[PDB]
Design a protein around this ligand. Sequence first.
Ligand SMILES: Nc1ncnc2c1ncn2[C@@H]1O[C@H](CSCC[C@H](N)C(=O)O)[C@@H](O)[C@H]1O
Ligand SMILES: [Zn+2]
Length: 1020
Amino acid sequence: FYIKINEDEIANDYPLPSYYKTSEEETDELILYDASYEVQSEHLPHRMLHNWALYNSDLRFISLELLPMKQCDDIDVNIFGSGVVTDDNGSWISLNMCIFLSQIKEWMIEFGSDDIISISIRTDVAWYRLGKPSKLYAPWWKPVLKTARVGISILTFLRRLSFADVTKRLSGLQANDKAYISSDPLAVERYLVVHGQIILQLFAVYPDDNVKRCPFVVGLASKLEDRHHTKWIIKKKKISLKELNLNPRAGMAPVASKRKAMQATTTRLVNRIWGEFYSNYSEIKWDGESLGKTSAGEPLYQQALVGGEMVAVGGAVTLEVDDPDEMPAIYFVEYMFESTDHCKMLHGRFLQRGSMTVLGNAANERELFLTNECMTTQLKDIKGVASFEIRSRPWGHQYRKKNITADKLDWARALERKVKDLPTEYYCKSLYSPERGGFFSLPLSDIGRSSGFCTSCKIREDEEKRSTIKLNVSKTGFFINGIEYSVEDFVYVNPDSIGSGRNIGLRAYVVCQLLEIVLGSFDVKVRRFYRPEDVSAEKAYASDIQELYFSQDTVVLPPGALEGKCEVRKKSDMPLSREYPISDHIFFCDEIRLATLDIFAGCGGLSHGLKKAGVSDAKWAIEYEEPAGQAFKQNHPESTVFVDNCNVILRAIMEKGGDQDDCVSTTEANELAAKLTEEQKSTLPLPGQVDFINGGPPCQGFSWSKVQCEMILAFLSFADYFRPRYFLLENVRTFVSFNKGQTFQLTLASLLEMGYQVRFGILEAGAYGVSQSRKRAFIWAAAPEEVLPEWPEPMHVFGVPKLKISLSQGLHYAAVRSTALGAPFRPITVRDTIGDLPSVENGDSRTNKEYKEVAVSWFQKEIRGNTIALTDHICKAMNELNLIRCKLIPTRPGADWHDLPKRKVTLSDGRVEEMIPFCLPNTAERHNGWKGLYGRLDWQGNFPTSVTDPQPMGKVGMCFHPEQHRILTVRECARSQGFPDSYEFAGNINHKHRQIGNAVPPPLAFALGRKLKEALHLKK
Ligand SMILES: Nc1ncnc2c1ncn2[C@@H]1O[C@H](CSCC[C@H](N)C(=O)O)[C@@H](O)[C@H]1O
Ligand SMILES: [Zn+2]
């Protein structure tokens, strides 16, 4: 009989589960060898194996101790392996063609000198001496050696004793020794009894016979019986080679891997900026006569002499503040007058330094920014004057060279002005606004008027007047938060003020009608409306998004419970344009289009939304992979899609433009560009024909030699070269936190240096109509003569706190308000998205089908439309074990692998495997019990983060249909993102899943495009 210890006992000494991966094809083991008649355990050939790796059927790394150390027939556990086979040669270990094996039968250890051990593996075909292991399998090999150490040392001590004495004598040795185990006797006893087979074989293999008869070995053999284990039998039968290879990867063609990255081709400006950053950081009198009088009669002047220095409107003065180590502040003066007290007042606006802004250390040293804050002081004492000027340059792609030629010269002067120890001359080009989070354009007509009227002061006074509730003269309305409320209006009330499962139980705005009025010493009495969700979930599922019900409930509230105004219309006259997502606060009860250029196009969700908005038409495109380019061509036939690498399309464009000296490129880029034919070269766009550039580079990760392949430098170079009237950048939420946010600051600095007005924001798509949580970072950029678009207003309640970008000096900016408190419309659940699709079986492959059930939900109605050809309703396939595991998970929400019963299942192939997929170590740092794996969804919940590859092998997460025992299909994943049912995808299932995963929800792009159209309609 043989005693085999279960993996749970030794799991405490082994790391967390990890799965085997490879990229090179292998050959079957049985092919190489003859597989002759039955022979003894010695006649098999002896060879060595390097780079070994052992795993179970699930391709999960397993320990060597799971293999019996003697000959047994009814082996209940099957372990497979891989490596490289070489001719045998004597090589020991003391202290420091690819081939996958068949089922592994046994392992044997032999002892040599005082510190010489050897291990070998026997299969049904031949022996294999053991060598160096793989880098991934190293952690699973350390304990096996460690226990061996525990043996070796104690042997040197045996040269007639009880069992506890050796334990207490071992518990006292210091932790610095290589044989240290633990000081607690219980721990040393447990470890000694849990790895008893290895040291038992070591004792039984020793040349000396006296050690074999020590009571230690028999006592340990007796005590091995108590705990969890299994029992086998021992026999010396002749092994038969008649078998077939049963490796899980008998087929399993290698997955594409090692997609190499190369240096990006850029222009001079962007490369210069990023490289420069990363190389170093990784007697007072008046002048003239009076010009007028203020509102109170104070005469105003325009010029003064202070200590010999000249002060005038448009200059800059310096004050004094505490902490003298800090530099003094700068104030741009607006007007200076004389008061009734025969004193000289002045009014100034603070000019912030770049280093205190969002840019941080990436900001320009000589660039100051106008601020909203302003103050008045006395002209009597001012540290001094400072050189200052407002910079304004013409816009266009034809001035670019000129705009460059001056800059160096300017910088040259600065360098000289730093060499000669002269005061630095500052400048201001834009207006920094942290309260809006952006660098807007200077209102040149409203600054330095010397009239006694200050625009910023009036704005602050109006804002102070705002939020102060005051009654109206007619006693029928009031003014609160800038809103003029009156009788017979419709108002929003917070749900609390009225007496995954992230959004479960979340309510929305309560719509009420003002009844009457009962500083601020009054209250409001209003009526009550009801929502379909207030009845049942079924009623809310099959009802319009804007439906409402009437009730006669009247209630009185303080004026602070109102959030805005809404409109209620009869069910006979609507705007007649069912736009989606909705942007108009309306309920019911009863010639500007610009030529664009899409970079990193993908499938084209963003381009689809922008075109649907009406401000874009995809006249050109750039992609990398064939299936994505084919899909983009299919969906947008009029676009001229370029499939060749983008990093060389820029080189081709520059070469066509005759400025090859202003484009740094690799040697391969020139050869690739020269290989293009004549039609594609003639189709390339030229500067001046592009008025919109959008796209998102794939820069995700956590130094100059590495950040030169981020793929965003090429995007910045494209924007610099073409100089469109508008620019859009999109990336992941964590884009503003890579390398402590250095890349985001650098992108902002480059955009400012080119000359745009930029603004940034983190937007959650779930509040705009989609049913999937997805947060993205967006950057808008506009020309100085245009108007930067405003951020769209979310309309759906979704539970997520305010997503704030961290400014400098403890400041946060939130682009949009958090919609968890309330919103006009309810969120979208799982059943509202993919409920109507017909059921499919596991591993379906029919691309074209026919719809079976009519649309019920508002989302289904708005996303189906009139198409009658179901496309890409296919899902991946599971093997026997995975399908059986899937079938055992209940349909309740929140289910995971914790509900899988503990047992072993024999497959039809002829293998026995454990049902439990993982063996986590007890008393370890396994967060939340590894929940979420093998998990179903919820009908009323929301979709989790979309994975680019939901894989049915190994560690499979929450990607299961709530009812059917399968994985979600391609069409369901597309629908969860808001993609219209008429959209087309190309490639195999993996490529389509990757295409859908990387796509941006079309509704968000439509909202951004609508805001851009509103901005464009206002330039006049
Ligand atoms: N060097 C490169 N040149 C061109 N395309 C690239 C690229 N590296 C990645 N891509 C492609 O750019 C895309 C990144 S995700 C962009 C998705 C797109 N904005 C949408 O809304 O659908 C992927 O399709 C990726 O394959
Ligand atoms: Zn002012």
